[PDB]
């Protein structure tokens, strides 16, 4: 039972120090996520990631791998309350916006933090998202977190972690707690490690994009937009150099002599027409390359910025990078075994046709019972 | 560090009878 | 080109004379409390056949109060090595600031000087000080400190005050342990190469930043190594009623936007706390 003895004590020895309430994210990453919210391409991808995950519908349900005959749906009334809160979080907040904040913070920092206020009997009351930038956490002596610090001076709620909290006789908590869902990385260090974010490896191209675009705006206003650099010689009696100017200039659309030829008798004036291309100021070729980098690093098929690419973007990066980690984090500590949080795949409008044909063809097979024909395409029982 | 001495208490017994 | 993860630091704390003093928590920055100076005498052994009485003399109730002092500091960086480094200067400095605050609070509650620092019981000098006698050697009158004196001082505590621990340096403890009787035997731990009795049971809490009378463990004293009479040796007090420590708010850290000129990003850190001495009759100081 509860080993309480993890091999994560390798770091509290000297690499770390207990009882310090260290921050979870470096200030550099916080600022990096901030300026990336106004960057055109970065913001575009970030709002896309949050948007699509915000479209999925929640529900509590039986898990398929239910070998636990001793179901952990302790009361079946905590589950209905859990269903209520999953669809209606803390007042002035919907489940959709909760999903948006969770997946967004997961994309910018690689973490998910929440808050629960279970009343007295495993019945969850409300759920709050936590600002990942200004969230501090405090470690135990063995290997893990014991409390979370949230606020600098006034707000000092030492919210206990899920591992250490007043539990029921069955295992469910009775008081408040937090989650701190984490994304793993190299060298283990389950929580002592550095974040795992696409923002790590996009620093250079976004810096290039800003530099090249700044060059574009500047050269737009500052390069003369005039043509026909005409030049005379120092033998032309300024007083008639005006009229030859008035002769050439007064040919504009809607002029005195507009569209007629220009005759200069004697004192041959010499015109040269400037090119002023101004058609590659943003460096089109070394701009779309960097756009493809900051879009591909977020896991976005370029075609999105045809339907097969949408199917890929949904079921190659969105599903197993924001949907599976969020559900297992919730399913880990929000309800007992046998029951867990599930989202209906058929709510995604892009995969409806795919589910349709797969269901249709499976209908044709015969060496297969009806229940497993169901379970292979959702439809529990 | 320079070599520091290790002076310890000697045979301390009396405070009330001087020897003749 | 093979940078390791080794971070040898090699710096020490003291012990902590914090779990000894009575701890109290206050929210506001000014607390106040009553005290009974003396009950006074009421009623005498009057004679008989005297239809009268005497009013005696009433007692005295005083009303004292105390503030809590703040402790603050500031530190900045350059945001360039902070970005390019292979370490975490932020956490390093947070740890260093907490360490400095702890050691400063300890030394203040010990030896604080009046204004804007809690008056330590050392500088208070209202704990009765018992000074030990000097010894004779070859006619010279060098001062000394014996196990006899140590036992006398630990025993002379008033019994009705309660159980009282003692505080003293490990150098003093080693000096005590390495005593020799007349012929050659050790006084404590006869014939086991070391004397290490259970401290918690002998009620002797140990620390490392007391005045340490044996300078650098180099003042045993037979010639020019005398204890330099007038040096603190040990203290013994009912600490749960002699010195109180008031706590208001733990350490807090805050970036200072403004003043950060885009080159050196700056944090500030702060705390508030304090201490005082109540009835400084419980408590004595053994000195050379």
Q: Touching check for B16 and chain C: CB below 8 Å?
A: no
Tokens describing residue A159 = 């919210």
Q: How far is B8 from chain C (nearest CA, A)?
A: 5
| DSSP secondary structure code for residue A4 in this structure | -
Neighbouring residues of C84: CB distance < 8 A, sequence distance ≥ 6:
none
Query: Is B6 within 8 Å of C218 when comparing Cβ atoms?
Result: yes
Question: What is the chain A residue with the closest CA to C271?
Answer: A153
Residue C280: closest CA among C64, C53, C50, C25: C64
Show which residues on chain C lie within 8 Å of chain B, measured between beta carbons: 133-136, 144, 146, 175, 178-182, 216-222, 225
Token pair of A145, please? 């977190």
Task: Measure in Å the smallest separation between the Cα of C218 and chain B Cα atoms.
Answer: 6
Residue C222, SS3 per DSSP: coil
Nearest C-alpha in A relative to C254: A152
The reply to whether residue B12 touches residue C133, judged by beta carbons under 8 angstroms, is: no
Residue C140 CB contacts under 8 Å (≥ 6 apart), including other chains: none
A167-198 in b/e form (b: 16+ CB < 10 A) is: eeeeebbeebbbbbbbeeeeeebebbeebebb
User: What sections of A150-256 are H helices per DSSP?
Assistant: 203-220, 241-249
Are residues A147 and A155 in contact, defined by beta-carbon separation less than 8 angstroms?
Answer: no
Check CB contact under 8 Å for C83 and A28. Answer: yes
Nearest by Cα to A311 from A351, A366, A273: A351
Q: Subunits with at least 3 CB pairs below 8 A relative to chain C? A: A, B
Give the determination technique: cryo-EM
Encoded tokens for A305: 């910025």
- To test the contact with chain C by mutation, choose from B4, B11, B12 the residue with the greatest count of C C-beta atoms within 10 A, namely B12
Q: Which residues of A199-225 are buried (b: 16+ CB within 10 A; e: fewer)?
A: beebeebbebbeebbeeeeeeeeeeee
Chains C and B touch (3+ CB pairs under 8 A): yes
Question: From the CA of B10, how many Å to the nearest CA of chain C?
Answer: 7
Query: Residue A149 forms beta bridges with which residues?
Result: A136
Across the interface, whether the CB atoms of A28 and C249 are under 8 A apart is answered no
B20 in reach of chain C (CB within 8 A)? no
Tokens standing for residue C119: 């008056």
* Terminal alpha carbon distance of chain A: 33
Residue C159: exposure state from Cβ atoms within 10 A (0-12, 13-18, ≥19): exposed
Tokens at A134, concatenated: 């200004």
> Checking phi first, is residue A201 left (phi over 0); if not, alpha (psi -120 to 50) or beta?
alpha
Chain C residue with minimal CA distance to B6? C218
Residue C146: which of B5, B12, B18 has the nearest Cβ?
B12
Chain C hits for B7, CB-CB cut-off 8 Å, are 218-222, 225
Residue in chain C closest to A28 (alpha carbons) equals: C83
Here the tokens at position A105 are: 């913070």
| Pairwise CB contact (< 8 Å): C90 & A23 | yes
Do residue C220 and residue B14 have CB atoms under 8 angstroms apart? no
SS3 at position A29: helix
CA distance A359 to A379: 11
Tell me the torsion sign for CA atoms C215, C218, C220, C224: negative
Instruction: Name the packing angle between helices A40-53 and A203-220 (round to 10°).
Output: 130
Q: What residue spans of chain A are helical by DSSP H? A: 27-35, 40-53, 78-87, 95-109, 203-220, 241-249, 285-296, 307-312, 324-332, 352-364, 370-375
Question: Helix or strand or coil: residue A296?
Answer: helix
What is the rounded distance in angstroms from the CA atom of residue C75 to the CA atom of residue C267?
6
For residue C107, what are the contacts with CB-CB under 8 A and spacing of at least 6?
Answer: C209
Question: Residues C34, C62: contact at Cβ < 8 Å?
Answer: yes
Please provide residue A182's backbone torsions phi and psi, each rounded to the nearest 5 degrees: -125, 150
Q: How far apart are CA A315 and CA C22, in angstroms?
A: 63
Distance CA A177, CA A148 (A): 9
Contact list in B for residue C182 (CB cut-off 8 A) is 11, 13
| Chain B residues within 8 A of C180 when measuring between CB atoms | 9-11
- Is chain A adjacent to chain C, meaning 3+ CB pairs within 8 angstroms? yes
DSSP state of A173: B
- Chain A adjacent subunits, 3+ CB pairs under 8 A: C
Taking the alpha carbons of A350, A354, A355, A357 in that order, is the dihedral positive or negative?
A: positive
Question: At CB < 8 A and 24+ separation, what contacts does A246-249 make?
Answer: none
Resolution (A): 4.5
Identify whether the C-beta of residue A116 lies closer than 8 Å to the C-beta of residue A167.
no
**DSSP for residue C258:** T
Rounded Cα gap, residues A378 and C212, in angstroms: 77
Q: How far is B19 from chain C (nearest CA, A)?
A: 9
* Cα C167 to Cα C212: distance, rounded to the nearest angstrom: 11
Query: What gap in Å lies between CA A294 and CA C99, rounded to an integer?
Result: 43
């Amino acid at each position: 039972p509860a080993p309480s003895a993890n091999p994560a004590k390798i770091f509290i020895r000297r690499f770390f120090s207990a009882g310090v309430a260290k921050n979870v994210v470096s200030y550099s990453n916080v600022m990096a996520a901030q300026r990336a919210m106004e960057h055109p391409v970065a913001f575009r991808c970030l709002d896309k990631l949050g948007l699509t995950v915000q479209s999925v519908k929640w529900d509590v349900g039986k898990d398929p791998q239910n070998t636990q005959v001793g179901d952990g749906g302790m009361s079946a009334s905590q589950r209905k309350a859990l269903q209520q809160i999953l669809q209606r979080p803390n007042p002035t907040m919907s489940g959709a916006q909760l999903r948006y904040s969770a997946a967004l913070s997961w994309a910018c920092f690689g973490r998910m933090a929440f808050k629960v206020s279970v009343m007295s009997d495993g019945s969850v009351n409300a759920i709050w998202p936590l600002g990942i930038p200004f969230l501090k956490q405090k470690f135990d002596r063995y290997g893990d977190v014991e409390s979370f610090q949230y606020g600098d001076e006034a707000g000092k709620e030492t919210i206990p972690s899920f591992t250490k909290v007043e539990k029921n006789d069955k295992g469910r908590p009775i008081k408040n707690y937090a989650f701190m869902i984490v994304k793993p990385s190299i060298n283990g260090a389950m929580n002592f490690d550095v974040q795992n974010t696409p923002l790590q490896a996009i620093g250079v191209p976004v810096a290039l994009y800003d530099a090249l675009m700044a060059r574009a705006i500047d050269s737009a206003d500052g390069t003369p937009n005039s043509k026909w650099l005409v030049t005379a010689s120092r033998d032309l009696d300024d007083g008639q150099a005006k009229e030859v100017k008035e002769g050439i200039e007064e040919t504009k659309p809607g002029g005195d002599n507009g569209g007629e030829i220009i005759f200069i008798a004697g004192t041959d004036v010499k015109v040269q027409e400037m090119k002023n291309d101004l058609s590659d100021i943003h460096s089109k070729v070394p701009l779309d390359d960097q756009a493809r980098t900051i879009a591909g690093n977020f896991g976005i098929p370029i075609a999105l910025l045809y339907d097969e690419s949408r199917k890929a973007f949904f079921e190659d990066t969105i599903e197993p990078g924001y949907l599976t980690p969020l559900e297992d984090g919730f399913s880990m500590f929000l309800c007992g075994a046998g029951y867990r949080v599930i989202f209906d795949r058929d709510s995604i409008p892009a995969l409806r046709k795919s589910r349709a044909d797969i269901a249709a063809t499976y209908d044709k097979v015969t060496f297969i019972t009806e229940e497993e024909k169901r379970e292979v395409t959702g439809w529990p029982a | 560090a320079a070599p520091s001495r290790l002076v310890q208490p000697g045979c301390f017994i009396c405070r009330g009878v001087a020897v003749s | 080109p093979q940078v390791l993860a080794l971070e040898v630091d090699c710096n020490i704390e003291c012990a902590s004379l914090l779990d000894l003093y009575g701890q109290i928590e206050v929210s506001r920055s000014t607390f106040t409390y009553m005290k009974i100076a003396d009950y006074g005498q009421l009623g005498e052994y009057t004679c008989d056949a005297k239809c009268d009485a005497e009013f005696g003399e009433p007692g005295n109730i005083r009303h004292l109060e105390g503030k809590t002092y703040d402790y603050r500091g500031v530190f900045c960086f350059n945001r360039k090595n902070l970005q390019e480094a292979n370490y975490d200067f932020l956490s390093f400095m947070i740890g260093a600031a907490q360490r400095s605050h702890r050691i400063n609070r300890n030394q203040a509650l010990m030896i604080g000087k009046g204004v804007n620092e809690p008056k330590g019981w050392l500088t208070e000098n209202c704990f009765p000080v018992f000074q030990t006698l000097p010894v004779d050697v070859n006619g010279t009158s060098t001062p000394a400190f014996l196990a006899q004196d140590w036992r006398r001082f630990v025993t002379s505590f008033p019994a009705e005050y309660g159980e009282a621990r003692s505080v003293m340096h490990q150098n003093v403890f080693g000096y005590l342990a390495a005593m020799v009787d007349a012929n050659g035997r050790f006084l404590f731990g006869d014939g086991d190469l070391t004397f290490t009795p259970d401290l918690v049971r002998e009620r002797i809490r140990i620390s490392n930043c007391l005045p340490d009378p044996t300078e650098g463990n180099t003042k045993g004293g037979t010639g020019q190594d005398a204890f330099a009479a007038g040096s603190f040796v040990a203290a013994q007090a009912a600490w749960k009623t002699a010195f109180y420590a008031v706590e208001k708010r733990p350490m807090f850290f805050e970036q200072y936007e403004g003043g950060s000129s885009a080159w050196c990003v700056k944090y500030q850190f702060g705390a508030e706390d304090g201490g005082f001495v109540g009835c400084c009759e419980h408590g004595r100081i053994l000195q050379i």
